[PDB]
């Protein structure tokens, strides 16, 4: 039961009418707790998890100011980046960054992250040591030199060991029922005759939390890695997740196939067959 507070930030230099110049969504593990954005310089904030109703008004008023200041700073940085990469005005460009901290069961800090991308590609990453940076090119190497000359990671560590920990601790307490849980998958195999006369076996997993899961089909003396159709894990919209993996198999050979489900809420993997 390790836990993370994560924020996913996006700044857009020339967004469409009505679209955000700046947006960030905050999560604890796989549960979203808020939306912040700035549209035409107007900041807005919305709660997204029930425990956020326990926050004092001062939380939202400090947050509003953070949104305004972050949105302007990100816009300024998009302007500088356009210049250093000698790109054209009039085009829209994207600056993204992820901020997180992670604690263990005893609430001990285990790690933290700060990483940024420009136009969908890695730009700069803070290393595991929380003191040095990794760049990808000569523009981001300038950034690294600035941040290291300035000691800027000191102020990021002060954020990690200050407000990131504060909020992670408070949210895990106020949202304990939602957050300190693992819901195991409920799984079954569905059976679908095909026109050609063979069969689809679709192994389903529903109702699980958190999202991380593995579904695997195995025959017996055969590996089915390249035969499986696997959908990307997907939200049910009620806080749980679902997934399936399918294989096409000969009619009358269904009992040779086994679906295995691995999830942190299970004590041992489920092994499932088409029961019939």
């Amino acid at each position: 039961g390790s836990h993370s507070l994560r924020y996913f930030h996006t700044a857009v230099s020339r967004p469409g009418r009505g679209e955000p110049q700046y947006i960030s969504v905050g999560y604890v593990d796989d549960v979203q707790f808020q939306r912040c954005d700035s549209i035409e310089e107007i900041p807005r904030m919305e709660p997204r998890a029930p425990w956020m109703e326990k926050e004092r008004p001062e939380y939202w008023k400090e947050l509003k100011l953070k949104v305004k200041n972050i949105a302007q700073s990100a816009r300024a940085n998009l302007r500088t980046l356009l210049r250093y990469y000698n790109q054209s005005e009039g085009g829209s460009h994207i600056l993204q960054w992820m901020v997180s901290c992670e604690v263990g069961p005893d609430m001990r800090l285990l790690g933290a992250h700060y990483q940024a991308a420009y136009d969908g590609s890695d730009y700069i990453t803070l290393n595991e040591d929380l003191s040095s940076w990794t760049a990808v090119d000569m523009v981001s190497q300038i950034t690294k030199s600035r941040l290291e000359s300035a000691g800027t990671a000191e102020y990021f560590r002060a954020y990690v060991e200050g407000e990131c920990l504060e909020l992670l601790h408070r949210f895990l307490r106020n949202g304990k029922e939602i957050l300190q849980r693992a819901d195991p998958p409920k799984a079954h195999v569905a059976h679908h005759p095909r026109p050609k006369g063979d069969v689809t076996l679709r192994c389903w997993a529903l109702g699980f939390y958190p999202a991380d899961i593995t579904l695997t089909w195995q025959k017996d003396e055969e590996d089915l890695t390249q035969d499986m159709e696997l959908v990307e894990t997907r939200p049910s919209g009620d806080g749980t997740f679902q997934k399936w993996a399918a294989v096409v198999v000969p009619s009358g050979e269904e009992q040779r196939y086994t679906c295995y489900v691995h999830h942190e809420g299970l004590t041992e993997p489920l092994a499932l067959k088409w029961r019939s």
């Binding site: 905050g26 500088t80 940024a116």
Partner: peptide
């Protein structure tokens, strides 16, 4: 809710 100037 933290931001570093990259340039």
């Amino acid at each position: 809710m933290f931001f570093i100037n990259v340039l």
